[PDB]
Amino acid sequence: KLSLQDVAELIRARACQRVVVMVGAGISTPSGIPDFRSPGSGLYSNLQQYDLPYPEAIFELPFFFHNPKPFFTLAKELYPGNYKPNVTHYFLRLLHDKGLLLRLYTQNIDGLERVSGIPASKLVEAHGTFASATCTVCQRPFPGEDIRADVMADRVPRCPVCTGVVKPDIVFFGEPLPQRFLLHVVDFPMADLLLILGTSLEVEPFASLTEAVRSSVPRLLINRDLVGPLAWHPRSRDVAQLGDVVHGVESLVELLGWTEEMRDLVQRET
Amino acid sequence: EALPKATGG
Ligand SMILES: *CCC[n+]1cc(CCCCCCCCCCCC)n([C@H]2O[C@H](COP(=O)(O)OP(=O)(O)OC[C@H]3O[C@@H](n4cnc5c(N)ncnc54)[C@H](O)[C@@H]3O)[C@@H](O)[C@H]2O)n1
Ligand SMILES: [Zn+2]
């Protein structure tokens, strides 16, 4: 089997020059944002006070059309927080600074990839963004700040033209993904390394991307535990660094010899 | 038609 040191040596020799990355909410728990499925602390274990038929309903499009108030109540709790990127985000920026990042596919809606300096064309926000919004009736677009302003004032955002409910451009369950998700069609067959960080690989079609790389390509998981195909459909060149994501990234950085570059980047940015 | 919908599976 391959080790983490083997992956670091492949990168250092530039045998791997074209890295695709898949991330989820586990990369932002070190920044103070809860994930969805962790025992005790995950969002799905902490929605009892909301007016929901079941927890998952708060992120489902048909329920949003039925009653959007629980979703906006929850959003009011994320807007004020001044979350910052952590070492995981800056490591992905360092990959770009070294010319190794092919594309970063994220499920997160916290915006921290952009804050850490990943350029828009290298980034696929596969489940959308709070940065923009769309009227659910007339489909007119609006900046995300308008929605933020209404929500923090305890109002459901309504369209100034038709009075329909205006929704942030996040992909709810049951909603189409953005067109740029289709970059995966070319990105994954030519990637020469896949990095998977902080995700349960439970949501589709995002999770199916893990099988789109070639069988000859290593898949490196940095996560608290084995998940998805890495758990039940493993491949011979899979590597798992099971533990905290910041500790795993710092270990990889040390094996790569990138400690000075990481420190310089974090200093500049913080 | 080519754009997929998000599911729990
Ligand atoms: C088809 C579309 C489905 N979809 C849409 C969305 C987004 C809905 C809107 C969200 C609004 C959030 C508001 C928050 C307010 C907060 C106020 C304070 N989603 C979302 O659900 C999916 C979640 O999947 P995930 O893989 O990203 O997250 P999980 O929690 O399921 O798994 C996390 C994973 O990471 C590990 N882990 C956590 N912390 C770790 C550390 N420190 N180190 C290592 N590993 C860590 C956990 O053990 C677990 O394995 C996404 O698709 C998201 O977009 N879905
Ligand atoms: Zn409208």
Numbering used by the authors:
A (entry chain A): 122 to 391
B (entry chain B): -4 to 4
Text lifted from the article:
Sirtuins (SIRTs) are nicotinamide adenine dinucleotide (NAD+)‐dependent lysine deacylases linked to key physiological and disease processes. SIRTs catalyze lysine deacylation through a distinctive mechanism in which the amide oxygen of the acylated lysine transiently attacks the C1’ of the nicotinamide riboside residue from NAD+ (hereafter referred to as C1’ of NAD+ ribose), forming a covalent ADP‐ribosylated intermediate. Here, we report a new class of mechanism‐based 1,2,3‐triazole inhibitors that hijack SIRT catalysis by forming stalled triazolium– or triazole–ADP‐ribose (ADPR) adducts derived from the cofactor NAD+. These trapped adducts inhibit the enzyme without covalent protein modification, prompting us to term the compounds “Sirtuin Trapping Ligands” (SirTraps).
